[PDB]
Amino acid sequence: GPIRKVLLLKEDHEGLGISITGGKEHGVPILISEIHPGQPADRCGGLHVGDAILAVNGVNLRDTKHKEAVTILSQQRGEIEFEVVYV
């Protein structure tokens, strides 16, 4: 589908509210495999299970290994911009 930009608002006591799979070392993108009900990704409205995360806050995740993506994603705070695509 089309590449989309999505805004998520996270408070500091919360995580993003997603599970991710994949990573460059596995030859698969960083994919959203779960969205937790009531947590920030669900509340933002614009993210879906099956979305590939292409970037977050301008940081490219297309070529990142699984744990690299975990570190980068967990570091983001507050108003967080995602670039995503559903294939």
Binding site: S19, I20, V28, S33, V70, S74
Partner: peptide, 8 residues
């Protein structure tokens, strides 16, 4: 199963 999942 080959591919890991992390809750974040």
């Amino acid at each position: 199963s080959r591919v890991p999942t992390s809750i974040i």
